[PDB]
């Protein structure tokens, strides 16, 4: 249930208010890879997490003779 989701999330510490209001465990799967968020893990226990799965040349070219 909870730990089947949290398995895939590194818990960074307790609630850090500057990353927004707390998410539910169900909203947690929509958290962007690489971003951090607060989740309610239970009772009055809010925790900061991020996903364990993490995402990652010439933009223009000139023609010459």
């Amino acid at each position: 249930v909870e730990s089947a989701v949290l398995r895939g999330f590194l818990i960074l510490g307790k609630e850090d208010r500057r990353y927004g209001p707390a998410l539910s465990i169900n909203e947690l799967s929509n958290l962007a890879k690489g971003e951090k968020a607060n989740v309610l893990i239970g009772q009055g226990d809010v925790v900061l997490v991020m996903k364990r799965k993490r995402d990652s040349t010439a933009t223009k070219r000139i023609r010459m003779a």
């Binding site: 818990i11 364990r52 993490r54 933009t59 000139i62 023609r63 003779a65």
Partner: protein, 424 residues
């Protein structure tokens, strides 16, 4: 020249061509050409855009297209005038021109405009570039066309903040799939770059990419001779294995791990790092998937990297080891401990980077938790990894952290400074 300006605005096709040809040659001479000196001349950029409409003169359409392409390379400010002159919609018309030279320089022009920024990329997409652009691939075109077209495609898919609306770029997935069967290194490389961008995001985007059939070929390109192909192929693969467990099995089934073990010995440091990074996304998998990494003999190499490689590589290998410890069984952790993972992980606790310490602490925490499982299998009440962590980290450091009074001091010091001096 005033004869350049005269002949340009004159009404003879001979002189029109001749002037435009001199305009190109100034923007073709190699040392960062005089773009602003051309763009500031009244009605000249708009005159080049008028020439694009002249369908009965191949050479002039090509020379004009060449000129505006080079203006389109360079500053965003410089690339603004080309858009505001209204050249994008007309270049997209030229994608359906009867002359190859014109079709191909139109693509390059639009590639440059798409490459200027997020906002220019989307405008080009919102002018329906895609349907005619994909139609180029629909015929046996020369190799330079195919390269220019995929390159433009990759620039359409590019950019993360914000990414392109996925419905506007996903139709290219079918083309990208068959393009992985071409031998040309330039086409393969840019096809992979495009795919790495499309699979960077939520798991619905990765489902669309896997659905297109690309994973096997991607995984096969991890063994290419040219790092220009391996880097982007590896970047696509690594992003697909940020998928749920079904999505990441899709890659394991293509035998990615023996290829990934090979890339951990790469002489190119960025490939080494990317291979660790990819592998860490798989060890965030289920126990089954962690076992496949164990059976490939990946961990001795990750542990070697964890204690000798340069910081940025070390950090990715740390993630790999720690994800393994979060998801794995007691027996799999026992094996990681026997290969010597505790010492390198402890050595990271003294590194001045808060992100790698978090990762290192998380792995030690997971090891210890399973050490409690073993302390009841054996009934002693002794966690076996306590003495090992003590050996690795030092009794001094363990004693410092065993003090609750030290804990109270640091908590208060952090709280106090953060409140009166602000957080940073």
């Amino acid at each position: 020249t005033s004869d350049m300006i005269e002949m340009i605005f004159s009404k003879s096709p001979e002189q029109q061509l001749s002037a435009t040809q001199k305009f190109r040659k100034l923007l073709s001479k190699e040392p960062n050409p005089p773009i602003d000196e051309v763009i500031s001349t009244p009605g000249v950029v708009a005159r080049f855009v008028e020439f694009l409409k002249r369908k009965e003169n191949c050479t002039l359409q090509f020379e004009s297209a060449w000129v505006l392409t080079n203006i389109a390379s360079g500053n965003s400010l410089q690339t603004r005038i080309v858009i505001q002159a209204g050249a994008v919609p007309i270049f997209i018309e030229l994608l359906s021109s009867e002359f190859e030279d014109v079709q191909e320089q139109a693509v390059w022009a639009l590639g440059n405009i798409a490459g200027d920024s997020t906002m220019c990329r989307d405008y080009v997409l919102d002018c329906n570039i895609l349907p005619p652009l994909l139609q180029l691939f629909s015929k046996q075109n020369r190799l330079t066309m195919t390269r220019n077209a995929v390159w433009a495609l990759s620039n359409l898919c590019r950019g993360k903040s914000p990414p392109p609306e996925f419905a506007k770029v996903s139709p290219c997935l079918n083309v990208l799939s068959w393009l992985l069967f071409v031998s040309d290194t330039d086409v393969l490389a840019d096809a992979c770059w495009a795919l790495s961008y499309l699979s960077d995001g939520p798991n619905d985007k990765i489902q669309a990419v896997i659905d297109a059939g690309v994973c096997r070929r991607l995984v096969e390109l991890l063994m290419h001779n040219d790092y220009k192909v391996v880097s982007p192929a590896l970047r696509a693969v690594g992003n697909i294995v940020t998928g749920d467990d079904i999505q990441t099995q899709v890659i394991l089934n293509c035998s990615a791990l023996q290829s990934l073990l090979h890339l951990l010995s790469s002489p190119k440091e960025s490939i080494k790092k990317e291979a660790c990074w990819t592998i860490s996304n798989i060890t965030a998998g289920n126990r089954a998937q962690i076992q496949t990494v164990i059976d490939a003999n990946i961990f001795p190499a990750l542990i070697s990297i964890l204690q000798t490689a340069e910081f940025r590589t070390r950090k990715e290998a740390a993630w790999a080891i720690t994800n393994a410890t979060s998801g794995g069984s007691a027996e799999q952790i026992k094996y990681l401990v026997e290969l010597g993972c505790i010492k390198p992980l402890c050595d990271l606790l003294t590194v001045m980077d808060s992100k790698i310490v978090q990762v290192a602490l998380n792995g030690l925490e997971n090891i210890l938790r399973l050490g409690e499982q073993e302390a009841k299998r054996n009934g002693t009440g002794i966690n076996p990894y306590c003495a090992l962590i003590e050996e690795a980290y030092g009794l001094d450091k363990i004693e410092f952290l065993q003090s609750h009074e030290n804990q109270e001091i640091y908590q208060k010091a952090f709280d106090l400074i953060e409140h009166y001096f602000g957080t940073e």
